[PDB]
């Protein structure tokens, strides 16, 4: 029963991995009472350790493999404490060090930089030369191009990225799409108009009609094959405008005389 | 020194009996001083003094001349090097 | 220990699990308050469902995590919202606080009250549960 | 012999009990013992060294005593027994005193006044073991005990105070010994030193006192900051408890200098800035405190260096701080060079030393402050220049490449300039007079708004020691 979860992963078969969990979730509530969830460690409690985390980590790449993103989160919330508590007789896994790398780019897919900084430093001591950067390279080097401002290199890492598959293409292939989107803020900036050509090479596409679709959904018209950047910027700006919270926080002349007078006066 | 005029915020704190204690407990929270490693690793340190004497060892006004060497040697060349080019255009 | 877990188990999704959750929490809050402090709102959710019995043991945590938070009054509410294993809470000396904070609530509406009519004690003008 | 020795620390003892003790049993006056106690700390511990070390045990004899010199006796024996002169008849001095509680009134009947005495006694206890620098087993046996102790009873509020300082020192030996080696039991304990601060807290908040509160929050602020857990530390922070009622100088300078590390990480700069700068003049400027000071100036100029501004070279020569600013001086030299290839040999060849201070995860994100600086010079130094002219000058591999970094940056406004797509240039755009426009309004008012904070501060402090003095009797 408990077992099945176990073997069910090394069919492939990672679909049936999420219908056979429910049993064996009710099942884990029973594993986790054995273990106190390491408030002491004993060696009867070791062999018992190696069953509470066994269904986690299978559990964990299953659910990536049918992109049940949320599903992950959870799954990796549950299993750091257990690495985290002890003095090593059993704190590590082969899978451990791939399930690092699979989070870590979760965070940079959806773009949640600040808790991706925060993550690491955290992380830093389990894999300094313990698990060392081995496989987690791969978010890390993209990080490093990223703060660079390269987004060459950025997207090289990408392209090489797919050759070698353990399975972070669920998390490639969204980062592909990430760095479209900011490299798209960073142009309306810099001019208001490329030729079409020049869009389709900085904004990584691979059929021209791919590049003007994504334009008009956009809000940029291209109108005898100039971009206008200016006018999703003035779409912008006039919806906040439109809203009103709006006096105060610019701060109108006469409020801020009258400002002075009173702190006076008190 | 410090961040700000730092002569300005020695004079302001000094010893009382209260803040002696005080002095103790912020110097034990990182156990020693934290000036003891450098002279240890190191064995007897080796810092920028070689370019000039505005550098790390200084107790005059900067001159700001350590970020960038003597440039009237290239000068002397390029002055001369302009010179013959100069002649025959 | 590590509030991750705890987290974890009230979004993974099977009812027992859920139920298994409030009692992790409940009996560990005065070292994982800041934690779960965002996450109210989910604990507010398996009050409201009537498919638990354990309902009265969500609300018992928040008035908990109220309490480490600062909002004593907030926190009467779901004291009484729990309605049983507060009795627990009235015997120790170490949370009175939320106990007494029902009594400073009293007084302000007695005085309300007392023009309306000498009894609104013997009458329903006020919740039921202040008054016991 | 040692008799005349154990006499002579008793006396000198009684009168540092007696400046104390006659206040608080007055009624209590919180803020005068709470400085008293700060002289008494340094006294004690010239005390307690020298003269033989068994002076502790016969203090306990002389006061009174349920249990406390049973417990005090156990301490003792753990470095190799005393009792001699340690018995009443020549450990006790009482025989009739009343400043330590007459003796026919102790034999006589109940009441206890066991309460100031024994939270007295712990303090001296933790000093004692922190002169020996023995921690492992003393330390472990002392811990376990006087915690249910301040918990028994329901503390005063004097009695916070001493408290104020006595998880300080099972804090520390217990970071200490964590740090020393690594068990199964080393991550055991963390989870009970957290545990017991944190509800304590609750019940501090409830006593009206602040010392507490204020101690508590910097110890469990520098335990998240350890172990990494910048999640922690974010929440602690956001659900406010701290006081600026009645504090230490020291107390803000710790609170301070936890809070801008925790900020830099997560990518916040701006308000570190106000946080490290505010912290180093709190603390006090002395050469014992040269540990806390030297570690505050190594973050202060890290953080200058994220936000993009540069701190003084005249910083790091003037100082007598050199020996351990050596590596901060060649990191802000090779960022305002803008030279990379400096950069990745610095941060090589100090790894050790910032890891220590523990900059050097700060170390990964300035090599984008590098590249920052190194195009903000030529954008100033050549108004238009083709990014063909900037490959040349600071080895960037191709036209794009470049044109990526302003593109980037210019969102942020680091260089503030426009990019010339088709003429294949970038054109700065920073150009000055703003005489004409509508600035000065806005920069004046935050100018404006600290004078006003500064008309605040001092309308209320100014009267209040005034009003304390003239109510005290005076000729």
């Given amino acids: 029963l408990t077992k099945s979860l176990s073997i069910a992963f090394e069919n492939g078969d990672y679909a049936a991995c999420e ?136 997207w090289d890492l990408l392209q090489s990225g797919s050759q070698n598959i353990s399975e972070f293409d669920s998390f490639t292939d969204i980062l592909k799409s990430a760095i479209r989107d900011e490299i798209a803020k960073n142009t309306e900036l810099s001019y208001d108009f490329l030729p079409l050509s020049n869009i389709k090479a900085l904004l990584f596409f691979n059929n021209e009609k791919e590049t003007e679709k994504f334009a008009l959904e956009r809000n940029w018209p291209i109108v005898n094959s100039k971009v206008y950047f200016n006018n999703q910027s003035k779409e912008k700006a006039d919806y906040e405008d439109e809203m009103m919270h709006e006096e105060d926080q610019k701060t109108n002349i006469i409020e801020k005389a009258m400002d002075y007078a009173i702190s006076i006066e008190n | 020194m410090s961040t700000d005029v730092a002569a300005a915020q020695a004079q302001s704190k000094i010893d009382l009996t209260k803040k002696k204690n005080e002095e103790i407990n912020k110097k034990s929270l990182e156990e020693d001083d934290e000036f003891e490693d450098f002279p240890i690793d190191t064995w007897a340190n080796g810092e920028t003094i070689k370019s000039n004497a505005v550098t790390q060892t200084n107790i005059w006004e900067e001159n700001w001349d350590d970020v960038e060497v003597d440039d009237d040697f290239t000068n002397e060349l390029k002055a001369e090097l302009d010179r013959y080019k100069r002649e025959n255009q | 220990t590590t509030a991750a877990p705890l987290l974890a188990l009230l979004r993974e999704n099977q009812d027992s699990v859920k139920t298994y959750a409030l009692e992790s929490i409940n009996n560990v809050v005065d070292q994982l308050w800041s934690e779960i402090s965002n996450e109210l709102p989910d604990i507010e959710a398996l009050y409201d469902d009537d498919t638990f019995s354990d309902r009265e043991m969500a609300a018992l945590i928040a008035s908990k995590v109220y309490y480490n938070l600062g909002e004593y009054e907030s926190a009467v509410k779901y004291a009484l919202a729990a309605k049983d294993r507060f009795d627990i809470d009235e015997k120790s000396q170490f949370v009175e606080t939320i106990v007494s904070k029902s009594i400073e609530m009293y007084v302000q509406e007695a005085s309300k009250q007392y023009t309306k009519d000498e009894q609104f004690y013997t009458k329903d003008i006020i919740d039921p549960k202040l008054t016991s | 012999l040692h008799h005349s020795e154990k006499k002579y620390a008793e006396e000198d003892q009684v009168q540092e009990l007696l400046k104390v003790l006659n206040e608080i049993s007055k009624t209590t006056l919180t803020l005068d013992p709470r400085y008293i106690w700060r002289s008494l700390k340094d006294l004690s511990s010239l005390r307690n060294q020298e003269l033989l070390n068994a002076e502790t045990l016969c203090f306990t004899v002389n006061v009174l005593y349920p249990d406390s010199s049973s417990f005090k006796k156990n301490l003792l024996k753990f470095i190799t027994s005393n009792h001699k002169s340690s018995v009443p008849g020549s450990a006790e001095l009482r025989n009739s005193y009343p400043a330590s509680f007459y003796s026919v009134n102790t ?39 006087v915690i249910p102790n301040l918990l028994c009873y329901y503390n005063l509020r004097s009695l916070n105070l001493i408290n104020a300082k006595l998880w300080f020192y099972i804090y520390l030996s217990h970071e200490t010994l964590a740090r020393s080696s690594e068990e199964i039991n080393s991550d055991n304990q963390n989870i009970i030193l957290r545990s017991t601060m944190m509800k304590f807290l609750k019940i501090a908040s409830l006593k009206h006192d602040n010392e507490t509160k204020a101690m508590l929050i910097n110890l469990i602020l520098r335990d998240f900051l350890n172990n990494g857990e910048v999640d922690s530390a974010s929440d602690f922070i956001s659900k406010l408890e701290y006081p600026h009622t009645d504090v230490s100088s020291s107390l803000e300078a710790r609170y301070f200098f936890y809070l801008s590390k925790i900020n830099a990480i997560q990518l916040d700069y701006s308000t570190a800035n106000e946080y490290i700068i505010a912290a ?112 040349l000058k600071l080895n960037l591999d191709s036209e794009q490449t470049v044109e990526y970094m302003v593109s980037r940056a210019i969102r942020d406004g680091v ?61």
């Avoid at chain 1, 082969?94 to 993550?119: A, M, R, V």
């Fill in chain 4, 280 to 391: 180093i003049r709190k603390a006090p400027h002395n050469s014992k405190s040269l540990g806390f000071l030297q570690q505050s100036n190594k973050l202060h100029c890290c953080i200058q260096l994220l936000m993009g501004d540069i701190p003084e070279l005249s910083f790091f020569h003037q100082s007598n701080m050199q020996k351990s600013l050596l590596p901060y001086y060649h990191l802000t030299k090779a960022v305002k060079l803008g030279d990379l290839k400096k950069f990745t040999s610095t941060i090589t060849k100090y790894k050790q030393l910032l890891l220590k201070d523990d900059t050097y995860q700060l170390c990964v994100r300035l090599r984008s402050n590098v590249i920052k600086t190194g195009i903000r010079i030529i954008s100033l130094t050549y108004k238009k220049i083709s990014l063909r002219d900037i490959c």
């Fill in chain 1, 19 to 154: 219908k056979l969990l429910p049993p064996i979730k009710i099942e884990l509530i029973k594993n986790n009472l054995l273990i106190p969830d390491l408030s002491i460690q004993n060696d009867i409690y070791l062999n018992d350790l190696m069953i509470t985390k066994r269904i986690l980590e299978v559990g964990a790449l299953a659910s990536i493999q049918t992109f049940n993103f949320d599903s992950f989160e959870n799954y990796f919330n549950q299993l750091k404490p257990y690495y985290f508590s002890n003095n090593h007789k059993l704190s590590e896994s082969d899978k451990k060090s791939k399930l690092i790398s699979l989070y870590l780019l979760n965070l940079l897919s959806q773009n949640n930089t600040t808790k991706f900084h925060s993550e690491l430093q955290y992380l830093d001591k389990h894999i300094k030369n313990l698990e060392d950067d081995s496989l987690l390279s791969y978010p890390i080097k993209l990080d490093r191009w990223l703060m660079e401002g390269s987004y060459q290199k950025a």
């Fill in chain 4, 415 to 475: 260089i503030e300039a426009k990019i010339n797509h088709e003429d294949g240039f970038i054109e700065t755009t920073e150009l000055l007079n703003i005489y004409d426009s509508e600035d000065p309004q806005q920069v004046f008012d935050e100018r404006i708004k600290f004078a006003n904070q500064l008309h605040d501060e001092y309308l209320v402090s100014m009267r209040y020691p005034e009003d304390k003095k003239t109510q005290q009797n005076e000729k």
């Fill in chain 4, 107 to 145: 034999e006589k009947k109940t009441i206890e006044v066991t309460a100031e005495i024994n939270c007295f006694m712990h303090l001296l206890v933790q000093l004692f073991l922190w002169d020996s620098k023995e921690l492992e087993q003393l330390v472990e046996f002392n811990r376990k005990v």
